[PDB]
TrEMBL record, chains A, B:
The keyword Flavoprotein applies. Keywords: FAD, Flavoprotein, Nucleotide-binding. The keyword Methyltransferase does not apply. This is FAD-binding oxidoreductase. FAD binds at residues 73-76, 78, 139, 145, 149, 155, 157, 216, 458.
Length: 501, 501
């Protein structure tokens, strides 16, 4: 790599003012919440283009100078490494200034976006034009990116929650600087780019998700029509051990699609950590004991597990399924509550917002849980939607975090037939002993979950290799074959998903 | 290629009785319905393994002897080339003996299948075990394969109609003979292979659809729970020119998911061709005129367009949406009819069967339309679900087929935001002039649709290059890069989707 020559060429493409080339100038791309005891996850440079033509020039220069680019959209991957590259010596390719909304079709319920478009922008666009379409917001929201989240296959809480399922058409800058459009996009004068996902011949959009094979410059998305009627619900379960009964009750409702939105099943500990610090619940050096959790949860109108769903359509379509849903959840020991019961409950308000694709007051209390705070790593293993799987995963996760002196703070995102078990590893990152302990605990979570047949849907830069190691040796070798063929100079995001040149 | 050495080694793997190595032995793999005036689409051999270990040995031999393999599951790609390879000198890898149902999960609504599993087998398995799951049948059916059909991204007529969206997990024999499991399948002891589609890192399952990058040896599929209530409907439109009004009415019902199943919008000409020969409607050498079609259609309880949809769930969920659906379709000039009205109507019976995932009596009347019959090529361009697009596509298709002396016989498969415009080019293949004219007509359909920005979701072995040429040069070159890196010896299905070593 010839860094000085690459950065000088970059200034010629975007201007000196959008190239950041020394320790001091790249401070804005350098903060992470993941454990980094060796301080190895840090960029050496940032370049901020406003056009796809600039992106294509940047990629040609990157090849010529063998200078790797770590590409981000808005770079708000909080708990997954923010804008920190997976390996040393990378320049962040920050696409935040490519923030053009390119198309929105009210009739077909579609849009086409540059990567820099924020949830806030797209919400504002729809409201300002009176377009009765909804977005699907992965908790974070405001200055996060539909494009960046969809490319890391993130999740929101409407019927359109599984973001990658609703992506339709993308444009990619390939490692050699050529643009390719997927699906129907490469047909001159096509009006079906956001209409038909697959195109003809191999389906390649997936290659550009959680990967380093290309730079996405445009992406299409399907958007849900605003329903006549929106009815949010909260189910309260009293006991830490109700986990399997909740999964077993929700699964038939989801498999049969009586409930269509991805459901957050929130632990009392996680909910409390949103608005309270740990030392408001229990003293430092005391465990987060069941009795203290139950008391604090109860005083805040929360159970030990709080599961959020919604019904969408007419008063008549809602009336069609609400009785069966209530009877199933009640039989599981759940108390089903509506907005009228949950007035002024901030958790209900948080979920009520998310399940209509609303944006919440951008405020992340989890970062202040323990001591000086500032430590967050998502450990996000998959499970089949089986109560015994949730039961066993919760039990192993609790044993491992408690062994390292950390708390179990978790939610299940319930899908159709699967579950994202989201485990927030919360620590004091400012205390270098605690950062080291959180690193060791995270390694033990990954290793011991993998030995039971469980592994991550998504991970942070500090664990991408160890999570890749849970999956097959053939998978790893095949992704290396693709990398070497697609990006011969190894200049796109080396070590993303454990994929190294 | 060393054909004799390969075929001798293949006998060692599967036994002499499952290797077919000369003109007369390969006749069962050589019949096609597509136009082939040069008789160029024909295998030189066939091999029929019963195990994935046999497949791996066959692929190792193929690489050693440089002998290409054209892989098929059941090989019933009727109107898309059956088991004919896209290029000369290929041995069919016929996987029909790998017909094991590996898993069926009643609770999660999943299965795992070998490629030879037929629709009939899976239906029988579900009924024999009293498992209240449905399958989703692409018209064809009985002896077709859920695996083969999903790998070519075909379509059925339940809410699970878009087969590739419901695939979850696969095992592939890569060109070097190594097995690789996608999604969660490469995690030893994973119970989530059929639960979570994406896995971790680049999503690769699309690479093995409409492609020659791998041999699929196992595939997971999601299956729809049998609903309490199934209510099939037929909408009858009176005029050939109602096309745009039908699409414009269905689109909001589909975009808002009031109607969740892929809807077949059938031309009177196609319906008549299912049960009648052309010379029962008009004399040979007379055009298939609007008056004659209308008369024959009306005599059979059909309109000029007949659109099929179903409602699934309870009496209450059905009652929730049926009024809005009726009002919308009636306002478009459609007459909405139920089973009670359409008693003994064989078209209603045909669609009523499809839309509950039933299998029809395996009888393909389309193959006897004109003269000696035997000529069928699907021309299957995509459209955005816009009335004006259907209007313009129908108009150009009719002008081109009519200019070559053929009829417009077509259906639209209505999807969420897309249409599959399925044009059946019916011809007398036994008349070598008529086969030549159908070849020329087919070339004119692809080239002139492509000039208007329209191209195929799927195409027969005779047109795979001309359809690839409609899509981008960067797409073509990128698929060649992947082919060369994934299959260095070019031994899997050369020319599939226009992809050549
Ligand atoms: C309290 C809290 C709650 C959260 N809740 C959720 C949640 O419910 N669901 C969820 O999904 N996430 C959640 N997150 C995680 C995270 O904040 C979001 O997923 C966020 O949307 C990701 O940041 P982003 O949108 O800026 O994407 P980016 O950081 O811009 O993109 C993420 C990654 O995608 C790739 N990438 C991005 N753009 C491109 C491009 N143009 N071409 C190629 N590769 C590219 C890169 O690998 C990049 O690191 C949460 C985080 C916190 C702290
Ligand atoms: C009247 C009529 C109506 C039809 N209606 C429909 C319809 O509604 N919907 C529809 O989708 N089709 C329809 N078809 C087309 C066709 O009959 C079906 O799509 C059928 O399911 C395909 O044949 P098959 O299942 O045997 O798959 P195969 O022919 O076995 O597979 C198709 C292709 O997939 C690939 N392939 C298959 N197995 C593998 C493997 N294991 N590894 C790698 N590649 C593999 C090969 O390219 C192969 O040619 C219709 C045909 C007719 C004549
Ligand atoms: C379902 O995905 C996620 C959810 C959250 C918080 O609910 C954090 C990270 C994720 O990846
Ligand atoms: C939706 O796909 C298809 C449908 C049909 C129905 O005649 C035939 C071939 C196809 O590919």
């Amino acid at each position: 790599a010839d860094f000085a020559g690459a950065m000088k060429a970059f200034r010629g493409v975007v201007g000196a003012e959008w190239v950041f080339g020394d320790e001091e100038a790249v401070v804005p791309w350098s903060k992470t919440y993941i454990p980094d005891p060796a301080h190895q996850y840090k960029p050496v440079g940032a370049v901020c283009p406003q056009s796809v033509e600039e992106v294509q020039e940047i990629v040609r220069i990157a090849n010529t100078y063998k200078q790797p680019l770590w590409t981000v959209s808005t770079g708000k991957n909080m708990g997954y490494g923010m804008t920190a590259p997976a390996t040393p010596g990378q320049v962040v390719l920050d696409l935040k200034r490519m923030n053009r909304i390119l198309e929105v079709d009210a009739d077909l319920g579609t849009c086409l976006l540059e990567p820099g478009v924020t949830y806030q922008q797209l919400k504002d666009y729809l409201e300002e034009h009176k377009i009765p379409l909804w977005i699907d917001v992965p908790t974070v929201g405001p200055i996060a990116s539909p494009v960046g989240n969809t490319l890391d296959r993130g999740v929101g809480y409407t019927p359109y929650g599984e973001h990658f399922m609703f992506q339709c058409g993308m444009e990619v800058c390939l490692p050699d600087g050529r643009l390719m459009r997927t699906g129907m996009g490469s047909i001159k004068g096509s009006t079906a780019w956001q209409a038909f996902k697959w195109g003809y011949g191999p389906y390649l959009d997936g290659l550009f998700t959680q990967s380093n094979f290309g730079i996405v410059t445009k992406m299409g998305l399907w958007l849900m029509p605003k329903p006549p009627v929106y009815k949010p619900f909260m189910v309260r379960h009293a006991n830490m051990e109700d986990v399997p009964k909740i999964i077993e009750a929700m699964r038939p409702l989801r498999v049969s699609n009586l409930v269509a939105n991805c459901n957050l099943m929130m632990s009392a500990s996680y909910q409390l950590a949103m608005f309270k610090r740990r030392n408001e619940i229990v003293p430092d050096g005391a465990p987060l004991d069941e009795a203290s959790l139950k008391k604090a949860a109860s005083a805040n109108g929360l159970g030990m597990w709080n599961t959020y769903f919604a019904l969408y359509g007419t008063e008549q379509t809602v009336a069609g399924v609400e009785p069966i849903i209530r009877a199933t959840l009640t039989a599981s020991g759940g108390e089903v509550l509506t907005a009228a019961e949950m007035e002024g409950n901030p958790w209900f308000h948080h979920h009520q917002t998310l399940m209509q694709g609303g944006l919440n007051l951008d405020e992340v209390g989890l970062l202040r849980w323990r001591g000086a705070g500032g430590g967050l790593a998502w450990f996000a293993p998959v499970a089949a939607a089986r109560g015994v799987e949730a039961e066993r995963q919760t039990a192993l996760a609790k044993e491992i975090v408690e062994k390292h002196g950390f708390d179990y703070t978790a939610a299940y995102a319930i899908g159709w037939r699967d579950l994202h078990h989201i485990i927030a590893l919360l620590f004091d990152k400012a205390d270098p002993t605690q950062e080291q302990k959180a690193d060791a605990c995270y390694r033990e979570l990954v290793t011991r979950f993998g030995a039971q047949g469980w592994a991550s849907y998504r991970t942070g830069v500090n664990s991408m290799d160890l999570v890749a190691q849970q999956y097959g040796e053939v998978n790893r070798d095949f992704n290396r074959t693709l990398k070497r063929a697609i990006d011969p100079n190894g200049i796109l995001s080396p070590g993303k998903s454990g994929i190294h040149p």
